[PDB]
mmCIF file of N, CA, C and O and ligand atoms in Angstrom:
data_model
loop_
_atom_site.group_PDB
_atom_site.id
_atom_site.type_symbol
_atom_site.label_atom_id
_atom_site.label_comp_id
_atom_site.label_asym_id
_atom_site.label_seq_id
_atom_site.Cartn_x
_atom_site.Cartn_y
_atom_site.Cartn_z
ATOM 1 N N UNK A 522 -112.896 98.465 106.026
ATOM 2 C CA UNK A 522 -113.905 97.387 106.097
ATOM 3 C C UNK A 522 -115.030 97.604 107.102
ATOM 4 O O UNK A 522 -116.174 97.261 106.804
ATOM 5 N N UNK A 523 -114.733 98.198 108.356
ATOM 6 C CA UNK A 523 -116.134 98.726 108.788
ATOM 7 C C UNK A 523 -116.940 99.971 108.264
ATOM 8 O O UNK A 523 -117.701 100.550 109.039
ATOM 9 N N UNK A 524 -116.790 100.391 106.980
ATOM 10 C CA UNK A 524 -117.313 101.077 106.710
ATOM 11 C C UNK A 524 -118.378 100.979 105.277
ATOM 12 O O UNK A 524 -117.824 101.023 104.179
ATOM 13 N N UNK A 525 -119.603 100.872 105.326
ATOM 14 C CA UNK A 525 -119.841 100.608 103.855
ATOM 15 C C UNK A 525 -119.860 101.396 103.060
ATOM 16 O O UNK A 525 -120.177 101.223 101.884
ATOM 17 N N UNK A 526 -119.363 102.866 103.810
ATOM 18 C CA UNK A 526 -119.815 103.709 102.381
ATOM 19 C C UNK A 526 -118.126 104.021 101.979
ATOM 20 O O UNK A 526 -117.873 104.981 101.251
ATOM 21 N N UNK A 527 -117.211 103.297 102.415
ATOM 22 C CA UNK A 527 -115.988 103.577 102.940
ATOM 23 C C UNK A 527 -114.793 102.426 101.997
ATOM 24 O O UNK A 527 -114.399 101.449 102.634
ATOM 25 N N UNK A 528 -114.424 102.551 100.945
ATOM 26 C CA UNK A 528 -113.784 100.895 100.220
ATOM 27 C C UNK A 528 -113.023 100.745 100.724
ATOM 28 O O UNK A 528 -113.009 99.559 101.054
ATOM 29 N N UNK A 529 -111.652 101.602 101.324
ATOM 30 C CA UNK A 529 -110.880 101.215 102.129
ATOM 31 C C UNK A 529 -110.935 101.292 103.624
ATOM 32 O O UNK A 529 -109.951 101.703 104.241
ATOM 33 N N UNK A 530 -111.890 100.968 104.164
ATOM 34 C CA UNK A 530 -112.243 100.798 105.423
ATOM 35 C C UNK A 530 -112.977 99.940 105.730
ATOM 36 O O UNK A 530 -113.298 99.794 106.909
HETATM 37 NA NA1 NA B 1707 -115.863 99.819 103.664
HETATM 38 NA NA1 NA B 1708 -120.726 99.812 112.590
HETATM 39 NA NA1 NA B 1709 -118.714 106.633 106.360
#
Protein backbone atom coordinates (compact mmCIF):
# COMPACT_ATOMS: atom_id res chain seq x y z
CA UNK A 1 0.00 0.00 0.00
CA UNK A 2 2.75 2.53 0.08
CA UNK A 3 3.55 1.84 -3.10
CA UNK A 4 1.66 2.93 -6.27
CA UNK A 5 3.35 1.22 -8.72
CA UNK A 6 3.36 -1.72 -6.19
CA UNK A 7 -0.51 -3.77 -5.69
CA UNK A 8 0.70 -5.53 -2.92
CA UNK A 9 2.32 -2.86 -1.14
NA1 LIG B 1 0.70 -0.22 -3.89
NA1 LIG C 1 6.06 7.60 -0.22
NA1 LIG D 1 7.96 0.94 -6.66
Amino acid sequence: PDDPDDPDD
